[PDB]
């Protein structure tokens, strides 16, 4: 069954000889399993999808159920239009029936296929849910100890469940999320790195929304487990764990407080110096949404020694990380006490702030000018605006602020002149 032509597959499948159909279907599976350019469109245009879908229901020929399930899985892994052709052929209810198959390799293929269909977008995700996929999927995980399940089997179930949690506009149905969450929490405590990664991705999707969505996750008590996974050595685990933590601190201050209470701030010395750029960027973004909170939360950032790390990323990092650092500083100076803002200057924030006014990015200039104003406002309540003016001048910041009076964007130049007439005049 190696390297048949599509025409040969068609004559086999049209033969109405079940065994001839099995061999042609396996031939199609092997075509669709090759690395270089699987002929997905040729298979579709040959009209084979409804035949494959019909084969999913031949319970007394389990080999042709498996071969057609595999074939349809790989078609559904193509373009949106190729996934649509699988759905258009009636595959969703047929694959859901296959979840009850006594053959583990067959139900696994059905899990995989539905994951591909749900992974196309929110419409097919919700259609898979409407056909009732969740109950049979969760039933496959109703065992006392996940460790007794096959590793590949468990990984495929976790990945498909995460695709049912994925996408916005709209987010998944509330009652579907509530139904899935207890099983997700259990997978989040499993000891397989790939299960953990996909579990964290699912939690990161569920927390990417309004505070009500975040609350649903937070009240399951997963935040301490997320913080532990924040410290993992596997980058495929840290990345979604950090994204989930970052999403949660976009919620309320009380939701942010649970992240702090769980000990997340102690991981950020590593995260803010992490060699992977996106980790540094996402860690600094998370910090910016913590320095936007209450003064007692800003104080936790101070107590954990994280201000020097913010000075560090501002001083040298990828520019997108530096922009998140600028936001973190403006949020800090906006909501912080005078004492906290003083500490920021004592840690050396002024010079790397001034250097970033050189940047070809209009909004980071806006962000930095805001922070300078907030620091000056704290300096006036101390009568120490002259000392700050000297500092800003000594490091070349005044030269840059006055150059930005010449700036194209409107409130860049207005803000830069207000600074100079109020503090440097």
């Amino acid at each position: 069954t190696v390297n048949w032509s599509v025409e040969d597959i068609v004559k086999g499948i049209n033969s109405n000889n079940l065994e001839s159909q099995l061999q042609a279907t396996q031939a199609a599976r092997k075509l669709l399993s090759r690395e270089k350019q699987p002929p997905i469109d040729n298979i579709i245009r040959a009209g084979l999808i409804p035949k494959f879908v019909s084969f999913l229901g031949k319970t007394d020929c389990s080999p042709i159920q498996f071969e057609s399930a595999w074939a349809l899985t790989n078609i559904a892994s193509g373009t949106s239009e190729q996934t649509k052709a699988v759905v258009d052929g009636g595959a969703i209810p047929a694959f859901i029936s296959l979840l009850a198959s006594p053959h583990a390799h067959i139900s696994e293929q059905a899990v995989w296929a539905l994951g591909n269909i749900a992974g196309d977008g929110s419409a097919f995700r919700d259609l898979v849910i409407k056909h009732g996929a969740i109950d049979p999927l969760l039933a496959l995980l109703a065992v006392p100890d996940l460790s007794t399940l096959a590793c590949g089997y468990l990984r495929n179930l976790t990945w498909t469940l995460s695709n049912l949690c994925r996408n916005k506009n709209p987010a998944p149905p509330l009652d579907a999320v509530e139904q899935i969450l207890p099983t997700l929490v259990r997978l989040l405590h499993h000891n397989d790195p790939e299960v953990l990664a996909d579990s964290c991705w699912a939690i990161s999707y569920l927390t990417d929304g309004p505070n009500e969505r975040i609350e649903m996750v937070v009240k399951k008590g997963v935040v301490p487990q997320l913080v532990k996974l924040l410290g993992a050595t596997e980058l495929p685990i840290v990345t979604p764990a950090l994204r989930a933590i970052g999403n949660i601190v976009t919620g309320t201050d009380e939701q942010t407080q649970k992240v702090i209470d769980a000990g997340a701030l102690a991981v950020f010395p590593s995260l803010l110096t992490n060699p992977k750029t996106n980790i540094q960027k996402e860690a600094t973004w998370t910090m910016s949404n913590i320095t936007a909170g209450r003064q007692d939360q800003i104080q936790q950032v101070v107590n954990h020694g994280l201000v020097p790390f913010l000075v560090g990323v501002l001083s040298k990092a990828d520019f997108k990380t530096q922009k998140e650092a600028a936001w973190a500083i403006t949020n800090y100076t906006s909501g912080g006490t005078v004492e906290q803002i003083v500490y920021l200057v004592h840690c050396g924030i002024i010079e790397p702030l001034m250097n970033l006014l050189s940047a070809k990015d209009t909004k980071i200039i806006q962000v930095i000018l805001d922070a300078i104003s907030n620091i000056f406002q704290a300096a006036e309540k101390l009568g120490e605006t002259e000392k700050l003016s000297i500092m800003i001048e000594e490091c070349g910041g005044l030269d840059k602020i006055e150059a930005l009076q010449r700036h194209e964007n409107e409130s860049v130049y207005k803000a830069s002149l207000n600074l100079i007439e109020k503090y440097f005049s």
């Binding site: 669709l32 090759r34 996934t83 293929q109 992974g119 994925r166």
Partner: peptide, 8 residues
């Protein structure tokens, strides 16, 4: 963006 996996 879509999240799909081909079985090789």
């Amino acid at each position: 963006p879509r999240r799909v996996r081909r079985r090789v």
